[PDB]
Amino acid sequence: LIGRHLRLGSVESQPFMFFATEGCEGNDCWSGMVNDMVVKLSEDLGFTYEYIQPDDRKFGALNKTTNEWNGMIRDLLDDKTDMIAIDLSTNSARKSAIDYSFPFMDAGIKAVVKGEGTTLNQVLELLDQDKYKWGVIGSRHPETLLKTHRDSRYSRLVDEGVELKDLNHAIETLRGGLFVFIDEGPVLAHNLISDCDVFSVGEEFQSFEYAFGLPKDSPYKSLIDSHLLKFREEGFIDILWEKWSSG
Amino acid sequence: GSKNLIGRHLRLGSVESQPFMFFATEGCEGNDCWSGMVNDMVVKLSEDLGFTYEYIQPDDRKFGALNKTTNEWNGMIRDLLDDKTDMIAIDLSTNSARKSAIDYSFPFMDAGIKAVVKGEGTTLNQVLELLDQDKYKWGVIGSRHPETLLKTHRDSRYSRLVDEGVELKDLNHAIETLRGGLFVFIDEGPVLAHNLISDCDVFSVGEEFQSFEYAFGLPKDSPYKSLIDSHLLKFREEGFIDILWEKWSSGNSVC
Question: Which of A95, A148, A222, A228 has the most B C-beta neighbours within 10 Å, making it the best mutation to test the interface with B?
Fold first, then answer.
């Protein structure tokens, strides 16, 4: 990678990435756990880089009507980027189109709701009531996992729930009350630390990892994988999580 | 790409490693000598991907580590490098030393290092305390992942622990030594959870530390990695791995 330039797909995804929309130039507009990882990779491996956001601002999912991808996944498939540098959750749909790097963090699906004393015990119970509404963010991993789950009642949850634009939209809706937001454990841990009236619905389910995304046959996968494994083994990933997550 | 596994015959590196693999030493032939969580994974892979297989154990019965004197590998890792096997089908822990020589599949299970102790009286809170006392002896299994992590840790006091501890041959030897008392054994969480379930007089030495995965081992440039990875990810996502862990790992506790 010495001398090479990498175009890195990314989007705001706190605390993995924060994107400043003003008052900065180029790479300096980005900060967060993943940015710290990229900076260290670039120092150790000798590449230059830039970040490229998808115009649609989505993570990426496969539309089963059109058989087309969107988001960061689509940008990578279109050769607009060389690697996706974000908390990219591992799922079989994405694996059918792209590779993943060695994983840097474990993660699971988690559901949360505002208001003490929720009667709910498991998310599927939402289908048999109408006190609470619920939703997932469109074109993001949790939606994909629920839509591909063997038990098609999870597809019902997605199809009959609210489609959320992004995390800001989702947390806003959650705080409006009477709404179950289904997303990912680490994301919710960080972003809802101050919401003392927000509680968990059911236990976490599904087990997966966060990794970077790589195009199939990338010449960079071996080195990126080696270096990410080293970061994890040396404790760097933990140190960054402690730095960036609250708290 | 074009190469798939249909009609291939894979040689799979493995050893007994309960509850991932159990190896019967009599009253069986061939693949039927093997059972366990990993065996169930392999059977399913073979059905779905269309390969036949056999298991091959390293003569040294080690998992595999790099000897810094000779710069040579041993164990299942060495057999894989020597083309005696095509894939290591076992709880193969991810570490940087191994990654310099081989690739890993997609991971099937998360794991950490765990230290346990048997002994009455004063006890220990953290493994480095072992260096400043002589009540407890301690050890790790040679040429296995915990030893490698301790030997490669930035803080060379962990290398002291390995160098000054007892070298243990295998899990049977380690657990026998632990059960003999006044001993700290440093190994892996899932392995100890299963194998020490009935040892009510064995306790933890602090929290688990170091984070990693169990995966299968693959040679660099294997034409089979993409397919194996996809299928292992599907097993995980579909809940098959969790079902197998529940099937094979010990439950209850007289304790």
Answer: A95
Q: Give which of B74, B79, B101 is closest to B89, Cα–Cα.
A: B79
Are A156 and A63 in a shared domain? no
Full residue range of the structural domain in which residue A21 is found: 1-107+208-247
Q: Are residues A4 and A91 in the same domain?
A: yes
Asked if residues B65 and B73 have their Cβ atoms less than 8 Å apart, the reply is yes
Name chain B contacts of A229, Cβ cutoff 8 Å: 94-96, 99
Which of B96, B104, B107 shows the shortest C-beta gap to A209? B107
Residue B95 at interface with chain A, using a CB cutoff of 8 Å = yes
Q: Is B189 exposed, middle or buried (0-12, 13-18, 19+ CB in 10 A)?
A: middle
Same domain, A92 and A124: no
In this structure, the answer to whether residues A118 and A54 fall within a common structural domain is no
Closest CA to A111 of A205, A207, A161, A182: A182
- Contact B149/A at CB under 8 A: yes
Query: Which of B2, B98, B102, B106 to mutate: most A Cβ within 10 Å?
Result: B106
Same domain assignment for residues B196 and B127: yes
Resolution in Å equals 1.3
Per the structure, the count of domains in chain A is 2
> How many Cα atoms are found within 13 Å in the side-chain-facing hemisphere of B177?
21
| A106: closest chain B residue by CA | B110
Q: What is the CATH number of the domain that holds B28?
A: 3.40.190.10
CB contact, 8 Å: A226 with chain B? yes
Q: What is the DSSP pairing of strand A18-19 with strand A133-137?
A: unpaired
Helix (H, G, I), strand (E, B) or coil at B1: coil
Interface test with B, best of A148, A151, A207 (most B CBs within 10 A): A207
CB-based contact, B156 to chain A, within 8 Å: no
Residue A15 DSSP SS3 = coil
Number of Cβ within a 10 Å radius of residue B25? 7
Q: Are residues A196 and A227 in the same domain?
A: no
Question: Quick one: B143 and B102 in the same domain?
Answer: no
Q: Are residues B18 and B34 in the same domain?
A: yes
Is B4 part of the contact surface with chain A (CB cutoff 8 Å)?
no
